[PDB]
Design a protein around this ligand. Structure first.
Ligand SMILES: *[C@@H]1O[C@H](CO)[C@@H](O[C@@H]2O[C@H](CO)[C@@H](O[C@@H]3O[C@H](CO[C@H]4O[C@H](CO)[C@@H](O)[C@H](O[C@H]5O[C@H](CO)[C@@H](O)[C@H](O)[C@@H]5O[C@H]5O[C@H](CO)[C@@H](O)[C@H](O)[C@@H]5O)[C@@H]4O)[C@@H](O)[C@H](O[C@H]4O[C@H](CO)[C@@H](O)[C@H](O)[C@@H]4O[C@H]4O[C@H](CO)[C@@H](O)[C@H](O)[C@@H]4O)[C@@H]3O)[C@H](O)[C@H]2NC(C)=O)[C@H](O)[C@H]1NC(C)=O
Ligand SMILES: O=C(c1cc(OCC2CCOCC2)nc(C2CC2)c1)N1CC[C@@H]2CN(C(=O)c3ccc4[nH]nnc4c3)C[C@@H]2CC1
Ligand SMILES: [Ca+2]
Ligand SMILES: [K+]
Ligand code: NA
Ligand SMILES: [Zn+2]
Length: 805
């Protein structure tokens, strides 16, 4: 109930919300049907429009006007934004040369530079270049401030998941807003764009910026605007709030624009009708900046111009229909469009089988424009699994396409020419970032980065301590002139053992055999020193990884590689080796094909055994350091140590063999040497975090050898490729992956062809940040470099995307 009887007089755009049934005058009241009767008349004035004209100058205050051109307007803080331009001979902000803002130039009483976050829905990254002639204010912010060529949204590249990620620093799986549409089985409730359920606080996890600010005594301007409130009024309201007394004035403000998304959907991302909305967004930016300049705030405020996602060309005829694949199509619920989520229509139907649904959707048509996944098999870089609101069965839809259940859904719902929601690596989904202000750098371009990082930076801009989040705090320090955050490296929790020769061959009863009874003081002091770590500076370029949890592990040295061997998981946590440009690929000799050798430094009790693999009809084994890249016939024997062995399905060995035999050498050739760190990952509960031993769901049959869910590699070289990887003087270059360890290659539709036609594409799909691998393994890489820690943090967040220019 709303008793709409009270009044908005002197309460227009009030900052604290008041409790029903007392009527409301805040910027959200319309959206709750809760405004006082007089809200429109008092708060939403329009008379005379939004601009002063020559003859309105020095007029007598008429309170009915939308904005004022009277003499007192300045000190009332309610001039039209162009007032000083029309009436006092001033220039537009956009026409002034830019001048470095070395320090905040703020009115007396300002305790910190304010922050204004100007967010634009559907603003595709390439609009910065392609619409540059029609957006002169935006181009001035961009070229004078700090900008990235684009910013990576989160998956799915929808409106609510991305806006709430900007607010929280959290993946949608952690913040809970996993789509624009959702079913929560615990609540038995549904979240939709249209309607009231979305207002209930139980949907919204984490801690968004406005709450972080409030709890720490920073005042927040109410972030959200009822859709009917026009843009000009939002700007004037912000400017008016900025005129409040010190004790009442907020420090952080939000403006949201529905454009260009709204038009992008109707006309496609580059439709000729898209010029106008871009012009209009720019004009609004101009009004803000002119408004700030009038208040002498234009060298005081930090302004963020940020998009939630881009926009792709998508039409009704590019729809796949599940009714073309599925016989039981009425027994499923589909969340449709640019992604697919499938569950059973009814939980009482015990004949619903996800396994058979997946198989029926897998590689069925030569040009199929979606791929089905169990959510835990999605590329780990999407971080899209650990939420009860994310259905077990997911469809990754090709860019430019839609998925629907039945054709009736598409014509009883071509209207639209643009959409978004695809894989967040897709170029058309990239969006924008521009920071302008005393705290951002001057005329600086920064590399692309992910939107999950910005919450930390907005917290830094306001002197707040961020709630725990998925950003890597410090990885965006290179955006900022000051207020940087100086993190320390995490402390190593477990130190390694350095075992020597402690066991005799005959103590091993592993069912392993090797043709190695093949016989000198020159090459014997030599093998001793290699086992003591004489070549360790060659293969361990950035120090050993730190183990950040309690465990028992050993460092093992070899001529060609170094490993940290886990006595608990019976395999390395990591294996590190360097392959120079000059290195040679060799094959495994025939006498060594099934050779597995006991490691005399590690107890039988802490070793794998060959018998488990013989018994396990599903499971085979591979090696972390590839025998193909051994430096010499004698060094090759080290690669067959039982301590370099890891469990691998035969289907995954195809993937692994090609990577190790062909790709490593190829990268060394292209990058002038590479350092490689490889290892297993165990993520049975798909939370993106290292499993403890009691979480492991699968072992090699009859043994305690745990089966990894994934294998990672981190491939580092010199950013200046004219220097070799092992003698690099400056910044580094990295690419990494987290390959799912699967008993089949159903994911790759062309897997019956030669590995040369499908493996690299699979790896590219499962590209990863080093930081993703840190979460998954409890390890911390690049501990010993000459580089600044902030720069290392930036490198650890890098994602090699494999999209063109
Ligand atoms: C991205 O960053 C985020 C933030 O840093 C990371 O997520 C954190 O990871 C922590 C480790 O998994 C996790 O810690 C757990 O928290 C439990 C209490 O948590 C509540 O309080 C916080 C603080 O206010 C709150 O934010 C949480 O909010 C979640 O839950 C509500 C729903 O109730 C949602 O609205 C909200 O969106 C959020 O959901 C997300 O997280 C949960 C898990 O917490 C998921 O299940 C959801 O899918 C969703 O993703 C909470 O309200 C605490 O009870 C846990 O402690 C257990 O485990 C420890 C091990 O140390 C042990 O000491 C205890 O015994 C205890 O076990 C008991 O509970 C078990 C489960 O019932 C049971 O089996 C046992 O036998 C015991 O009874 C634990 O410490 C933290 O909550 C989240 N935070 C957030 C915001 O998600 C995320 O990891 C990062 N991602 C990556 C890839 O890096
Ligand atoms: O006020 C907002 C808002 C702005 C915002 O800011 C967060 C800032 C954090 C700091 O960093 C900067 C951001 N956070 C949110 C939610 C997440 C908490 C909402 N909205 C008004 C319009 C409504 C109507 N919508 C639609 O009707 C709609 C719009 C576009 C669509 N595309 N496809 N479907 C669509 C449906 C979208 C819906 C949400 C957007
Ligand atoms: Ca886990
Ligand atoms: K086997
Ligand atoms: Na296949
Ligand atoms: Zn949209």
């Amino acid at each position: 109930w709303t008793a709409t009887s009270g009044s908005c007089k002197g309460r227009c755009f009030e900052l604290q919300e008041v409790g029903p049934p007392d009527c409301r005058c805040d910027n959200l009241c319309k959206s709750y049907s809760s405004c006082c009767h007089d809200f429109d008349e008092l708060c939403l004035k329009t008379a005379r429009g939004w601009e002063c004209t020559k003859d309105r100058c020095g007029e007598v205050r008429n309170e009915e006007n939308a904005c004022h051109c009277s003499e007192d307007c300045l000190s009332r803080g309610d001039c039209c934004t162009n007032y000083q331009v029309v009436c006092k001979g001033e220039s537009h902000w956009v026409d002034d040369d830019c001048e470095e803002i070395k320090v905040p130039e703020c009115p007396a009483g300002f305790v910190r530079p304010p922050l204004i976050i100007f967010s634009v829905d559907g603003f595709r990254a390439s609009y910065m270049k392609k619409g540059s002639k029609v957006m002169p204010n935006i181009e001035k912010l961009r070229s004078c401030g700090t900008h990235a060529p684009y910013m990576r949204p989160v998956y799915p590249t929808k409106t609510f998941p991305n806006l709430y990620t900007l607010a929280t620093g959290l993946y949608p799986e952690s913040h809970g807003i996993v789509g624009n549409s959702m079913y929560d089985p615990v609540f038995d409730a549904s979240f939709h764009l249209r309607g009231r359920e979305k207002f209930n606080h139980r949907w919204w996890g984490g801690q968004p910026l406005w709450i972080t600010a409030t709890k720490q005594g920073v005042r927040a301007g109410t972030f959200f605007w009822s859709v009917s409130i026009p843009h000009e009024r939002r700007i004037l309201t912000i400017l008016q709030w900025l005129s409040l007394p010190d004790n009442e004035r907020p420090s952080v403000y939000a403006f949201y624009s529905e454009q260009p998304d709204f038009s992008g959907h109707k006309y496609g991302p580059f439709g000729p009708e898209m010029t106008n909305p871009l012009r209009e967004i720019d004009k609004t930016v101009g009004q803000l900046m002119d408004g700030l300049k009038q208040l002498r705030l234009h060298r005081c405020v930090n302004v963020i111009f940020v998009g939630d996602h881009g926009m792709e060309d998508v039409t009704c005829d590019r729809t796949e229909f599940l009714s073309n694949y599925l016989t039981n199509v009425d027994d499923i619920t589909l969340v449709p469009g640019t992604l697919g989520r499938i569950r059973a229509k009814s939980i009482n139907n015990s004949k619903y089988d996800p396994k058979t649904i997946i198989a029926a959707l897998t590689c069925k048509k030569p040009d199929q424009h979606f791929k089905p996944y169990m959510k835990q098999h999605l590329p780990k870089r999407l971080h899209y699994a650990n939420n009860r609101r994310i259905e077990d069965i997911h469809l990754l839809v090709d860019r430019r396409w839609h998925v629907a259940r039945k054709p009736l859904d598409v014509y009883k719902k071509c209207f639209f020419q643009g959409d978004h929601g695809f894989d967040n690596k897709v170029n058309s989904m990239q969006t924008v970032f521009v920071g302008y202000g005393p705290t951002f750098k001057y005329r600086t371009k920064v590399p692309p980065f992910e939107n999950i990082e910005l919450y930390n930076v907005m917290c830094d801009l306001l002197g707040l301590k961020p709630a725990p989040n998925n950003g890597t705090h410090g990885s965006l320090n290179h955006l900022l002139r000051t207020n940087t955050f100086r993190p320390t490296m995490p402390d190593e929790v477990s130190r390694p053992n350095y075992p020597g020769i402690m066991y005799l061959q005959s103590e091993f009863d592993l069912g392993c055999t090797c043709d190695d009874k093949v016989e000198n003081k020159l090459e014997e002091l030599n093998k001793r020193l290699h086992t003591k770590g004489s070549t360790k500076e060659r293969h361990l370029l950035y120090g050993r990884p730190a183990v950040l949890y309690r465990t028992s592990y050993d460092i093992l040295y070899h001529t060609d590689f170094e490993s940290g061997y886990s006595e608990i998981f019976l395999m390395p946590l990591w294996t590190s080796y360097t392959i120079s440009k000059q290195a040679e690929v060799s094959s495994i000799p025939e006498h060594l094909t099934n050779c597995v050798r006991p490691d005399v430094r590690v107890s039988p009790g802490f070793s794998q055994n060959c018998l488990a693999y013989k018994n396990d009809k599903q499971m085979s084994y591979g090696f972390l350091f590839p025998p193909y890249l051994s430096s010499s016939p004698e060094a090759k024997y080290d690669a067959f140590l039982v301590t370099n062995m890891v469990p691998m399905y035969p289907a995954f060995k195809r993937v692994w063999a090609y990577f190790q035999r062909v790709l490593v050498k190829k990268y060394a050739s292209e990058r002038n040497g590479v350092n490689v760190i490889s290892g297993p990952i165990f993520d049975y509960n798909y939370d993106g975090l290292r499993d403890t031993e009691d979480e492991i769901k699968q072992y090699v049959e009859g043994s305690s050898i745990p089966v990894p869910t994934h294998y990672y590699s981190i491939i580092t070289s010199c950013l200046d490729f004219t220097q070799p990887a092992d003698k690099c003087d400056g910044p580094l270059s990295v690419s990494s992956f987290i390959l799912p360890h699967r008993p089949d290659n159903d994911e790759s539709c062309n897997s019956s062809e030669d590995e040369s036609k499908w493996v690299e594409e699979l790896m590219k799909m499962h590209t990863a940040r080093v930081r993703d691998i840190e979460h998954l393994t409890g390890l911390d890489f690049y501990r010993k470099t000459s580089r600044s820690y902030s720069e290392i943090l930036t490198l650890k967040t890098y994602l090699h995307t494999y999209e063109s220019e």
